[PDB]
Design a protein around this ligand. Structure first.
Ligand SMILES: O=P(O)(O)O[C@H]1[C@@H](OP(=O)(O)O)[C@@H](OP(=O)(O)O)[C@@H](OP(=O)(O)O)[C@@H](OP(=O)(O)O)[C@H]1OP(=O)(O)O
Ligand SMILES: O=P(O)(O)O[C@H]1[C@@H](OP(=O)(O)O)[C@@H](OP(=O)(O)O)[C@@H](OP(=O)(O)O)[C@@H](OP(=O)(O)O)[C@H]1OP(=O)(O)O
Ligand SMILES: [Zn+2]
Lengths: 151, 476, 476, 152
C-alpha cells in the first residue's frame, strides 16, 4: 500500500480544485492500479495533440475574427428532394393473415383478401427472402398457367 | 440569527435583496406564486412584534420574531432560502469514495457533479434541477475533459408547437448533451478551418477524419426511459410480454413514463393541425434515441457533409443500472443489422458506478421542476429554458415578458451552419429549407432509411416521424 | 336479478361501458364525480368483499356484496344506471346572449343547438354528438328557417369500400349538410313540378332560377379542416411561407388532421385494387371542398340539368379569430380565377360569432364516437350512420345485425333522380351508368375541368380524384 | 338598455325557447331593428308573395303519394355523352405486357401492391379447379420459404 494513497489523493483534490478535468497518472504500477481503466478503452497514442489546447468560449472567439485567415475545405452542397412516403400499407396481425390464407371460397371475393395477405407476407420478408419468394411465385404461376403466361 | 452566512454572501453577490432572490427561486421551482401570512403578538414589555409565515413546496415555513413586518418577511425568506439551497440541506460536496475497484465512471460522476455545483456559484438560481443530469467527456490518452452538461426530464407541450423551429422538441438531459456536442464539433470545424494542427480533425479522404486517440464518453445520472428503467414488481409474464421488452417505445406529452406501441391509435403519421387542437404528439424514448445515435452516429445529418460518423465509447448509469438490460436496450437488439459503409454498429461499453442508495436517492419521489438548464464548452455560459415552450424567457425594465429562441433550436443550428459555409467560402444552393438541407447527405439519408426499414421488418415497431411542417421553414 | 333488463338494453344501445356512462350522467346532473367505496365484510373464517355504493339523488345505490372488484363495480354501475333511467331527465342549459352588436350569427348558433335537442328528446340515442355540428339556414326577407343539420368528423375506411356506391365516403358534417340541402332541393324541384306558385324556383331562360330574396346560409361550430386550421400567425414573413400555407391538403381515413403534398407528388391516380391491397384512401379536406363548392356551386353536376348554380350567401364559424384566416382559404385562393358562363366566383360573406367559442366540448374526449347523424327538413326524420363503413346498422326481428344503405348514398340519389325522370315524363337514355349521368352536364364538366387545370397551373396542388370504379355501377 | 329594446329581446328569447329553427325579425321600428342588426350585404329588402309557412316538414314523403296526372313536364332532355375512355371497366384486364412487367419487376418499392394486383388478376382468370390447386401450392410455398413469419 505504497504510493497508492499518494496517487489517489491527487484525484481526490482534482475534483475540488479543478472540476471537470481528470489527469490520470501512469508510468508507475502502484499509481496505474488505483484507477484501472477498461482494457477496451486502454488505447495508447503518441499524437502531438494535447487536451490543454482547448479554451472555454472558443466559438465566440473564432466567430469574432477576420474572414481572411480562414481557408476553404473544397466541398459543395446541393439540394435534394425529401421522402414524403407515409406508412402506406395497413398492417394486420400474424393470426389475422392466417385465416385469410386458408379461406376456401376465395373465388367469390375475386381473391382480394388472398392477394392482400400475400402482399403483407411479402412485406414482412427481408431483401433475400422476398426475392426468392417472388421467384418461386413466378415459377409456380408460369408452370401451372401456360395459357396465360406463355404468350 | 440562525441564518447561515453563505445565504447572506450569495445574496450580496447576486446584487438583489433576499426577497427578490427567494421569489426568483420560487418562480423557477414551481409554476405559481408564494403565499404569505402574518401574525401580530403583544409582549410583556409593551412592545409589538410581527411574525411572517410562508409556504414553500407545500411545507409551512415560519420566520423569526421581528419588530417590523418587512424584517419578519426577510427572515422568513431567508429561512425559505436555506431550505431550498442544497448547499446546506444535504451537503456541499461529498468528495469521498472507495478506490482500488473498477469504478472509473465514479470519477466522471463526481467530476460532473462538481462542475454542476461550480456553475451554481456563478448563477445561484440554477440550483434545484439536479434530479437528472447528463454530460459528455472528451478523452485523449490519459486525460479527460467535460464538454457538455444539461438537465431536464420533460418534453414540449402539444399546444406550444410552432412551424419556425424556434421551440425545442425534447428537453430531456441526454438529447441536450448531443445538441451541445454538435456546437462543439462546429467550433472544432472552425478551428480546423484556420489552425489544422490545433484542431481535433485531420484532412483525410472523404471529408474530415477524427484524429486517432480521441473518443467521446457519455454519462447519465439515471437509467434512460424505454426498454431500461423497469421498477414494476409484477415481473415479466408470458412470451408476449418478453417480446415487449424489445419493442419500440414512445413518449407522451403532458404525461409521465413511456407507453407501449401497437394500440388502436398509433396508425397514420402525426399532423400539425391535429396536434394543434389536442392530438397527442409521439416522441421517441431516450433508449430508442440512444440506439439511433449508436447506429447512425451522433453528428446528425446536417454535419455529415463535413465530418465522418462519430460514435460513443462508453455509457454509464448511476441509479437503476442493469448491465444486462442496458446492453440489450442499445446494442443487442440491433447487433445483427448491417448498415451501409461507412456506418457500422458500435459495441459501446456498458459501465456502472459504485454508490447507490434508494432511501436517500433523488430519482423520482422528489419535487418536479418546469425549467431545464444546459451548459456548453463552446459557449462557456449556461442557458435556462422553459420546457412548456422550449424558449428562453427574460425580463426588462423590471417587467414585461420577453421570449427568446434557445441556442439549441433548429433555427440556431441552421444559422450556425449558414455562417459555417459562408466563412469557409463554400457555396450553397439558395433558397433552401431545413428539410432540403438535411436531405443533401445522400449517405446518411440512405443509412437512416435502411435502418428504419430493418426496424420495421424485424417487427420491433414503427418509428413515429415528426410532421413535415416542423422543418419547412426557409433558411436565409 | 336485481338489475332490470331495460337498463342492460340501454347500456348495450349506448355503446359505452356502464361505469363511464354512469359517471358522465352523474357529472351531467350533479356537480361532483362518483367515488367508489370498498368497505370489507368479515366472515368468521375471514373474507374480503367489495360493494361500491355512490350517492345519486339521495338513493342508496349500494351494490351486492361480492368477492372481487369487477363484479361489484359493474353491479354498482348498473344500479346507478337504473337510478338515472328513473326520474327521466337530461342535460339542459338556458341560453343567454349580448345584443345591440353584430349578433346575427349568434342567433343561428343558438337555434342550431336548440333544434338539436328537440330531435334528441324524440330519439335519445343521438346524445353526445355535439362535437361537430353544421347546419344550413334559408333566409326569405328577414325570415330564416333551418333546412339541414348533421354531425360527424370521420371517413370511410379503405377496406370497406365498394363499387356499388351504397357506402358513404365522407361523413363530415359540412358535407352531410350539403347532401341534405341537395335532398331539399330535389323536394323543391318536385314541388315546382307540381305547384310552381308554392315553390322557391321559377322558370328562367334556360333552367330553373331561384326567386328574388332567396338566400342560403351555412353555419359550422368549428373551423373546417385544412388551410383554415394550419396556423394562427399574423404574418407569414416570407413569400414562400404564404404560398405553402395556401396549398391544398388531403385527409386520410379516420385521421383528424391533414397531409400536405408538394408539386408533382401523388401524381399517379388511385387504383381500386391498390386500395384493397392496403393503400390508404386520400380525400380532400373541408376547406378545399368549400372552395370547390363556392367556385362551381353547391347544386352539383346532376342537379345542374334542371336548376341554375346556387352558392352560399354567408358562412359563420364560432371562433374568435376568424375573419382573414377563413377568407384566405375560402375566397382569396380562387379570387383571380375567371370561370366561363355560367358559374362564377362568389364573394361569400364571412361572419364571426359573438361569444361562446366551442373548442372545449369539440376537442376533448369526444372523438371516441364513431357514429354520425344527419337530418333534413325534406325527410323530417333523423338517421344515424356508422362512419366505419358508411352504412346504418339495425336489429331485425330475431336480434341479428341487418344493414341497409343510407338515404344520402349515391344509389339512393340516383334512384330519386330517376324517379324525378319518371314523374315529370322526362325520358332518359338506357342503360346509363352513374359516371355517364354526371358527364352529361357539358357546362359543369367543362367548368370543373377548367378549374382543375387552373389549380394545376397555379401550382396550388394536385386533385386526388377517386377511382372510376366508385361510380361504375349501372342505374336501374 | 331600454323598454322597447327589452321587449324585443324578451320576444327573441321566447322564440328561441319555444320554436327552435324559426327566426322572426322586426323592421317597422328603427329601435327594433337596432337590437339585432343585419349586415348591409345580406339585408336585401324586397317585395314578394312567398313566405316561410309554405315549407312543411316531411314534404318529400308526402309528394310521392300523389299520382302521375298532377305532374307536368319541364321540357328538359337528357342525353348521355362524354364517356371518359374505352378502358375496359373493372380493372379486369391488365395488358399482357404490363402484367408481365409487373410480375417480373425487381424494384419492389411499391410495397408489393402491384405484385399482389398482378397475382390477383392472374388468379381471377384461372378456372375453379386450377386456381384452387394453385392456392394449395402457393400456401405451401409461403409456409416453407419463411416459417418464422407464420410459425408465431
Ligand atoms: O431530438 P433530437 O435528439 O435532436 O433528434 C432530432 C429529431 O427528433 P425529435 O423530433 O424527437 O426531436 C428529428 O427526428 P424525428 O423525431 O423527426 O424522427 C430530426 O431527425 P429527422 O429529420 O431525420 O426526422 C432531428 O434533426 P434536428 O436535431 O436537426 O432537429 C434529429 O434527428 P436527425 O438529426 O437524425 O435528423
Ligand atoms: O360532396 P362529396 O361527398 O365530397 O362528393 C363529391 C361529389 O361526388 P358525389 O357524386 O358523391 O356527389 C363530387 O361530384 P360533383 O358533385 O362535383 O359532380 C365529386 O365527384 P366528381 O368529381 O367525380 O364529380 C367528388 O368526388 P371525387 O373526389 O372523386 O371527384 C366528391 O366525392 P368524394 O366524397 O369522393 O370527395
Ligand atoms: Zn373536415
Amino acid at each position: 500500500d505504497e504510493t497508492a494513497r499518494k496517487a489517489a489523493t491527487q484525484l481526490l483534490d482534482q475534483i475540488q480544485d479543478t472540476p471537470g478535468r481528470i489527469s490520470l497518472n501512469f508510468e508507475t504500477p502502484e499509481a496505474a492500479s488505483v484507477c484501472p481503466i477498461p482494457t477496451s478503452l486502454n488505447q495508447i497514442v503518441n499524437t502531438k495533440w494535447t487536451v490543454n489546447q482547448l479554451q472555454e468560449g472558443q466559438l465566440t472567439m473564432l466567430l469574432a475574427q477576420d474572414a481572411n485567415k480562414f481557408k476553404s475545405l473544397g466541398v459543395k452542397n446541393i439540394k435534394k428532394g425529401s421522402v414524403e412516403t407515409q406508412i402506406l400499407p395497413r398492417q394486420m396481425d400474424v393470426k389475422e393473415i392466417v385465416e385469410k390464407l386458408k379461406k376456401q371460397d376465395n373465388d367469390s371475393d375475386q381473391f382480394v383478401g388472398y392477394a392482400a395477405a400475400v402482399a403483407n407476407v411479402l412485406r414482412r420478408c427481408d431483401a433475400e427472402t422476398a426475392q426468392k419468394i417472388t421467384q418461386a411465385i413466378t415459377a409456380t404461376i408460369e408452370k401451372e398457367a401456360p395459357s396465360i403466361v406463355n404468350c | 440569527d440562525n441564518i447561515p452566512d453563505f445565504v447572506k454572501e450569495t445574496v450580496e453577490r447576486s446584487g438583489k435583496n433576499p426577497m427578490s432572490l427567494f421569489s426568483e427561486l420560487y418562480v423557477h421551482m414551481t409554476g405559481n406564486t408564494p403565499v404569505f401570512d402574518f401574525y401580530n403578538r403583544n409582549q410583556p414589555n409593551g412592545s409589538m412584534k410581527f411574525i411572517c409565515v410562508v409556504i414553500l413546496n407545500g411545507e409551512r415555513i415560519e420566520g423569526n420574531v421581528k419588530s417590523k413586518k418587512k424584517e419578519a418577511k426577510v427572515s422568513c425568506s431567508l429561512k425559505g432560502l436555506e431550505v431550498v439551497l442544497k448547499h446546506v440541506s444535504e451537503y456541499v460536496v461529498p468528495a469521498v469514495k472507495f478506490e482500488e475497484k473498477t469504478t472509473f465512471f465514479e470519477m466522471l460522476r463526481e467530476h460532473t457533479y462538481a462542475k454542476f455545483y461550480e456553475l451554481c456559484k456563478n448563477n445561484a438560481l440554477i440550483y434545484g434541477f439536479e434530479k437528472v443530469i447528463a454530460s459528455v467527456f472528451l478523452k485523449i490518452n490519459g486525460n479527460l475533459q467535460i464538454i457538455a452538461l444539461s438537465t431536464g426530464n420533460k418534453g414540449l407541450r402539444g399546444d406550444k408547437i410552432v412551424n419556425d423551429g424556434t421551440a425545442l422538441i425534447d428537453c430531456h438531459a441526454e438529447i441536450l448533451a448531443r445538441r451541445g456536442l454538435l456546437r462543439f464539433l462546429y467550433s472544432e470545424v472552425l478551428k480546423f478551418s484556420t489552425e489544422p494542427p490545433n484542431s481535433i480533425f485531420t484532412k483525410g479522404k472523404n471529408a474530415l477524419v477524427l484524429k486517432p486517440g480521441i473518443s467521446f464518453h457519455l454519462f447519465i445520472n439515471t437509467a434512460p426511459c424505454g426498454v431500461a428503467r423497469i421498477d414494476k414488481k409484477l415481473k415479466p409474464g408470458t412470451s408476449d410480454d418478453l417480446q415487449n421488452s424489445s419493442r419500440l417505445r414512445f413518449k407522451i406529452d403532458k404525461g409521465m413514463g413511456t407507453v407501449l406501441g401497437g394500440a388502436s391509435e398509433f396508425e397514420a403519421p402525426q399532423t400539425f393541425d391535429g396536434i394543434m387542437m389536442g392530438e397527442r404528439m409521439r416522441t421517441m424514448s431516450c433508449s430508442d434515441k440512444l440506439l439511433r445515435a449508436n447506429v447512425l452516429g451522433v453528428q446528425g445529418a446536417i454535419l455529415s457533409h463535413f465530418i465522418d460518423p462519430i460514435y460513443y465509447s462508453s455509457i454509464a448509469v448511476a441509479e437503476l443500472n442493469n448491465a444486462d438490460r442496458l446492453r440489450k436496450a442499445v446494442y443487442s437488439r440491433a447487433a445483427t443489422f448491417k448498415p451501409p459503409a461507412p456506418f457500422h454498429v458500435q459495441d459501446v461499453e456498458i459501465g456502472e458506478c459504485q454508490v447507490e442508495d434508494t432511501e436517500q436517492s433523488t430519482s423520482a419521489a422528489a419535487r418536479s421542476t418546469i425549467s431545464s438548464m444546459n451548459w456548453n464548452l463552446a459557449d462557456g455560459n449556461t442557458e435556462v429554458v422553459r420546457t412548456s415552450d422550449g424558449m428562453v424567457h427574460d425580463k426588462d425594465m423590471s417587467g414585461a415578458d420577453i421570449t427568446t429562441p434557445s441556442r439549441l433550436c433548429k433555427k440556431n443550428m441552421a444559422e450556425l451552419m449558414i455562417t459555417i459555409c459562408t466563412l469557409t467560402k463554400t457555396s450553397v444552393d439558395y433558397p433552401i429549407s431545413y428539410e432540403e438541407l438535411k436531405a443533401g447527405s445522400q449517405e446518411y439519408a440512405a443509412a437512416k432509411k435502411s435502418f428504419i426499414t430493418w426496424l420495421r421488418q424485424k417487427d420491433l415497431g414503427i418509428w413515429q416521424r415528426k410532421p413535415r411542417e416542423f422543418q419547412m421553414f426557409t433558411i436565409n
